[PDB]
């Protein structure tokens with residue numbers, strides 16, 4: 203008999219309860235939201251699925267073999283005291299990648315084509331032809347070339363954009379100029395539409411700021427460059443986005459993530475011209491997908507195969 | 520010395536005058552907008568570039584070898600009395616195809632992802648996550664599989680949509696179910712998002728009507744099906760689009776073309792929920808592109824090679 207999987211995830215508790223009815227069917231689960239588990243024995247527990255876990259979890263479950271993040275991010279876990287030296291697996295919803303690429307391509311097209319203007323005129327019953335350059339005249343600079351960035355690059359290229367990429371270690375991608383960490387300024391100077399698909403680490407906290415926006419290409423085919431972020435909200439400085447749009451440093455933005463979520467009602471972003479807001483719904487997983495992922499990794503682990511999507515502790519993502 | 524090319528195109532006359540300064544540089548042009556050409560001798564004229572030409576042009580220029588349409592469409596020419604039995608070449612701006620595909624993919628994504636709702640909530644400072652199915656769950660049915668439709672199909676497929684096509688003669692396209700003329704009802708019943716890329720002919724006049732909209736798939740992943748048209752406006756019955764959206768037969772629409780252009784200020788379409796209007800600017804040619812196209816076809820013709828993009832007179836497009 204395999205021991206049940208420990209689950210401590212701060213999502214809709216009623217939703218989690220329901221998924222867990224059919225998850226882990228060979229072993230069951232220990233839902234830490236249930237008061238009947240306040241004094242549960244975790245001595246045999248092998249696997250823990252955690253999202254914003256209780257601080258003393260690792261004292262209670264000292265024999266864990268693998269930690270599974272309940273999210274795509276691991277900032278919620280990585281900084282915890284007493285985090286054991288065991289693999290931490292991030293949630294890579296293999297079906298979510300394509301949905302992030304739908305969002306990225308749509309946002310880039312809406313900026314390329316002038317959706318903001320089209321919609322403003324439509325609401326005023328104004329017939330107003332706009333000029334847009336073809337995609338090939340515009341360079342999209344993708345920051346982050348991991349699971350999400352490499353899919354976005356591929357699809358943006360097919361739509362016709364010139365695409366360049368930036369990552370901590372330079373990638374090799376056919377047809378796409380790619381840059382190392384240290385080449386940030388050069389990469390920004392070539393970029394008309396910046397697409398952010400970075401994890402949140404100390405190095406990427408407050409990264410998208412006034413100074414960065416002033417380095418984007420100023421004499422490109424869109425007139426003024428555009429900032430797009432669907433990575434993590436704490437990577438950007440929103441007051442600097444607001445100032446940059448008002449002063450014309452940025453021609454617009456598309457944002458799915460924010461420093462504080464939900465975005466405050468009084469944020470200036472909501473009504474800023476040429477700014478598109480989605481409420482962190484660009485690529486949210488269907489509720490079972492996390493559990494299917496964890497189950498699959500357990501199966502690999504129990505056949506003696508390598509875990510996938512293991513984070514690099516020293517790098518922080 | 521080759522004779523100058525006859526040009527009778529009802530566009531901005533000042534714009535046409537300017538392009539013609541550098542066009543046809545080995546022979547010149549005869550601009551019929553110029554009053555100095557009211558009594559010009561066209562006995563030697565070989566080529567005519569026409570958009571909504573004068574009715575007696577063919578009496579004045581009886582020795583024409585080739586007619587070039589000034590537009591992508593040829594409805595403006597095809598019905599004319601005394602139209603000579605010589606090739607008519609349509610304007611296929613080889614660089615416009617990719618721009619039509621940008622528009623089609625953007626519109627399909629905006630309907631897939633709920634841009635209308637996102638934007639409505641954003642304007643009200645409301646944080647409101649929406650559910651959207653992945654593209655693979657939605658079938659886009661492309662009507663017209665010519666230069667524009669085949670490019671749209673390819674790019675929609677890469678974005679992840681299921682795609683099917685319909686044309687007068689069935690095409691063979693790998694990975695895409697394709698249907699013949701007579702299979703329209705079956706094709707409509709499988710379609711969640713209809714994309715119209717048909718020419719205007721008698722058979723396609725008033726084609727997109729109430730009866731057609733009621734045949735689109737009703738139990739699909741978008742809930743209610745969507746109508747998209749960027750072919751010709753006279754192919755649709757706008758009052759039926761309005762009724763279909765109000766009654767819930769259509770979940771929304773995207774339109775670049777209209778029965779009467781510009782779209783009347785009082786049209787209900789402007790303010791209809793889930794309807795996106797662009798003012799016939801999805802794929803408008805840069806002003807020189809027409810002349811470069813005509814020049815290239817003349818060069819082929821003068822080397823004894825076949826003209827390209829010749830219309831099928833019996834079929835009407």
Ligand SMILES: NC(=O)C1=CN([C@@H]2O[C@H](COP(=O)(O)OP(=O)(O)OC[C@H]3O[C@@H](n4cnc5c(N)ncnc54)[C@H](OP(=O)(O)O)[C@@H]3O)[C@@H](O)[C@H]2O)C=CC1
Pocket residue numbers: 274275302345346347348349350351368369370371372383399400401402403405406432433434458459482483484485486519
């Ligand atoms: N808005 C949303 O709904 C969602 C947002 N996300 C967010 O997207 C992020 C990216 O996801 P994913 O692509 O799967 O992540 P990956 O870990 O696969 O890729 C991360 C990329 O970021 C690069 N990177 C990390 N740190 C730096 C740095 N300091 N300098 C330069 N490049 C850096 C990495 O470089 P290298 O390749 O050299 O390692 C890599 O290319 C996630 O961490 C998550 O926060 C995820 C899902 C949904």
Ligand SMILES: NC(=O)C1=CN([C@@H]2O[C@H](COP(=O)(O)OP(=O)(O)OC[C@H]3O[C@@H](n4cnc5c(N)ncnc54)[C@H](OP(=O)(O)O)[C@@H]3O)[C@@H](O)[C@H]2O)C=CC1
Pocket residue numbers: 591592619662663664665666667668685686687688689700716717718719720722723749750751775776799800801802803836
């Ligand atoms: N909104 C805009 O700015 C623009 C609009 N357009 C419009 O787009 C139209 C399509 O352009 P393009 O793709 O280059 O044209 P093509 O002539 O290359 O293709 C036309 C397609 O329509 C199909 N078709 C024609 N009549 C019928 C019919 N009765 N039943 C079923 N299918 C039919 C043809 O079938 P088959 O393959 O069997 O011949 C073909 O697949 C143009 O005619 C023009 O009016 C063009 C450019 C810009």
Ligand SMILES: [Cl-]
Pocket residue numbers: 402434435436437460461
């Ligand atoms: Cl964040």
Ligand SMILES: [Cl-]
Pocket residue numbers: 719751752753754777778
């Ligand atoms: Cl029309």
